[PDB]
Scaffold this motif. Structure first.
Motif, mmCIF file in Angstrom:
data_model
loop_
_atom_site.group_PDB
_atom_site.id
_atom_site.type_symbol
_atom_site.label_atom_id
_atom_site.label_comp_id
_atom_site.label_asym_id
_atom_site.label_seq_id
_atom_site.Cartn_x
_atom_site.Cartn_y
_atom_site.Cartn_z
ATOM 1 N N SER A 179 -7.658 -6.903 1.247
ATOM 2 C CA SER A 179 -6.287 -6.486 1.457
ATOM 3 C C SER A 179 -6.011 -6.639 2.958
ATOM 4 O O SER A 179 -6.624 -7.500 3.604
ATOM 5 C CB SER A 179 -6.106 -5.071 0.920
ATOM 6 O OG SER A 179 -7.151 -4.238 1.379
ATOM 7 N N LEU A 180 -5.090 -5.859 3.523
ATOM 8 C CA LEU A 180 -4.904 -5.905 4.970
ATOM 9 C C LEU A 180 -6.107 -5.247 5.656
ATOM 10 O O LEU A 180 -6.747 -5.859 6.511
ATOM 11 C CB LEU A 180 -3.610 -5.207 5.388
ATOM 12 C CG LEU A 180 -3.259 -5.293 6.881
ATOM 13 C CD1 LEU A 180 -2.753 -6.677 7.223
ATOM 14 C CD2 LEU A 180 -2.201 -4.231 7.233
ATOM 15 N N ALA A 181 -6.420 -4.016 5.244
ATOM 16 C CA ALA A 181 -7.456 -3.194 5.893
ATOM 17 C C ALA A 181 -8.769 -3.076 5.109
ATOM 18 O O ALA A 181 -9.773 -2.633 5.671
ATOM 19 C CB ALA A 181 -6.899 -1.804 6.169
ATOM 20 N N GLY A 182 -8.763 -3.448 3.830
ATOM 21 C CA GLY A 182 -9.902 -3.183 2.963
ATOM 22 C C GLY A 182 -10.170 -1.705 2.752
ATOM 23 O O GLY A 182 -11.328 -1.287 2.689
ATOM 24 N N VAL A 183 -9.091 -0.937 2.594
ATOM 25 C CA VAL A 183 -9.146 0.516 2.472
ATOM 26 C C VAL A 183 -8.573 1.053 1.177
ATOM 27 O O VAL A 183 -9.106 2.028 0.639
ATOM 28 C CB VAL A 183 -8.354 1.155 3.659
ATOM 29 C CG1 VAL A 183 -8.105 2.671 3.473
ATOM 30 C CG2 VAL A 183 -9.088 0.892 4.942
ATOM 31 N N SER A 184 -7.501 0.433 0.668
ATOM 32 C CA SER A 184 -6.687 1.049 -0.368
ATOM 33 C C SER A 184 -6.361 0.102 -1.522
ATOM 34 O O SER A 184 -6.838 0.303 -2.621
ATOM 35 C CB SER A 184 -5.426 1.679 0.254
ATOM 36 O OG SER A 184 -4.654 2.314 -0.754
ATOM 37 N N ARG A 185 -5.562 -0.937 -1.297
ATOM 38 C CA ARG A 185 -5.213 -1.847 -2.401
ATOM 39 C C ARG A 185 -6.436 -2.534 -3.014
ATOM 40 O O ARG A 185 -6.623 -2.534 -4.230
ATOM 41 C CB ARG A 185 -4.217 -2.898 -1.923
ATOM 42 C CG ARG A 185 -2.798 -2.372 -1.757
ATOM 43 C CD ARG A 185 -1.897 -3.340 -1.003
ATOM 44 N NE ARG A 185 -2.246 -3.353 0.422
ATOM 45 C CZ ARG A 185 -1.488 -3.851 1.400
ATOM 46 N NH1 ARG A 185 -0.343 -4.457 1.115
ATOM 47 N NH2 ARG A 185 -1.895 -3.771 2.665
ATOM 48 N N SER A 186 -7.253 -3.127 -2.159
ATOM 49 C CA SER A 186 -8.456 -3.814 -2.618
ATOM 50 C C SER A 186 -9.462 -2.851 -3.236
ATOM 51 O O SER A 186 -10.038 -3.114 -4.285
ATOM 52 C CB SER A 186 -9.083 -4.556 -1.452
ATOM 53 O OG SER A 186 -9.231 -3.725 -0.316
ATOM 54 N N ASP A 225 0.842 -1.198 0.000
ATOM 55 C CA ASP A 225 0.000 0.000 0.000
ATOM 56 C C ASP A 225 0.873 1.242 0.000
ATOM 57 O O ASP A 225 1.009 1.911 1.016
ATOM 58 C CB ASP A 225 -0.969 0.059 1.180
ATOM 59 C CG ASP A 225 -1.893 1.254 1.080
ATOM 60 O OD1 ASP A 225 -2.177 1.670 -0.066
ATOM 61 O OD2 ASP A 225 -2.318 1.763 2.125
HETATM 62 O O1 4NP Z 1 -0.142 0.985 6.775
HETATM 63 N N1 4NP Z 1 -1.215 1.547 6.626
HETATM 64 O O2 4NP Z 1 -1.449 2.592 7.203
HETATM 65 C C1 4NP Z 1 -2.191 1.003 5.781
HETATM 66 C C2 4NP Z 1 -2.058 -0.309 5.343
HETATM 67 C C3 4NP Z 1 -3.013 -0.846 4.498
HETATM 68 C C4 4NP Z 1 -4.094 -0.084 4.100
HETATM 69 O O3 4NP Z 1 -5.090 -0.524 3.298
HETATM 70 P P1 4NP Z 1 -5.052 -1.795 2.340
HETATM 71 O O4 4NP Z 1 -4.185 -1.476 1.155
HETATM 72 O O5 4NP Z 1 -6.502 -1.880 1.926
HETATM 73 O O6 4NP Z 1 -4.614 -3.011 3.098
HETATM 74 C C5 4NP Z 1 -4.232 1.218 4.534
HETATM 75 C C6 4NP Z 1 -3.270 1.771 5.366
#
Ligand code: 4NP
Length: 158
Positions: A91-98, A60
């Motif tokens: 993804s890890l958080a379901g916020v950005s990559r996904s 991310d």
């Molecule tokens: O490290 N972070 O702050 C962080 C990590 C992953 C995040 O979101 P992801 O890409 O959906 O898993 C969003 C923020």
């Protein structure tokens, strides 16, 4: 729903976003009839039985290229949905990559630009917020390539 959401969320019929815990939750996967998982995170690999995986190792970070994975992600999602099945993109958080991959999908199956596609994701999953680099990649996709991807979709599946 908190910074990693509150459970996997339906975005469109047959399309869900969640965090890494959601992706291992047999109760949620069963309840939502999830038979396909697109895992996009540092350590993505097939884990569970009963699930077709697409695994994309990715950070991310604005330095991470996700555009090069749009086509394979869209194919994976679309073929699942055309068969009446359900796909979880996590993804890890379901916020950005996904979220980014799902935005690219929505942009391809509608006439939406990335902001309208992001609005659509946020309606289902309020924590959706791609990193500013992923936003730029989505903006470039909107400008230069989404029209070709729409035509490809029509040619392959229409
Ligand atoms: O490290 N972070 O702050 C962080 C990590 C992953 C995040 O979101 P992801 O890409 O959906 O898993 C969003 C923020």
């Amino acid at each position: 729903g908190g910074p990693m959401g509150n459970g996997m969320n339906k975005i469109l019929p047959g399309l869900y976003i969640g965090n890494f815990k959601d992706a291992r939750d047999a109760a949620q996967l069963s309840a939502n009839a999830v038979t396909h998982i697109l895992s996009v995170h540092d350590s993505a690999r097939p884990m569970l039985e009963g699930v077709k995986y697409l695994c994309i190792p990715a950070a991310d970070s604005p330095s991470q290229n996700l555009t090069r994975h749009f086509k394979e992600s869209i194919k994976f999602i679309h073929e699942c949905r055309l068969r009446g099945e359900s796909c979880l993109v996590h993804s890890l958080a379901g916020v950005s990559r996904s979220v980014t991959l799902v935005i690219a999908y929505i942009m391809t199956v509608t006439d939406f630009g990335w902001e309208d596609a992001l609005h659509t994701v946020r309606a289902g999953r309020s924590c959706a917020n791609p990193n500013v680099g992923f936003q730029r990649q989505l903006q470039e996709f909107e400008k230069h390539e989404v029209h070709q991807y729409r035509q490809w979709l029509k040619e392959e599946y229409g």
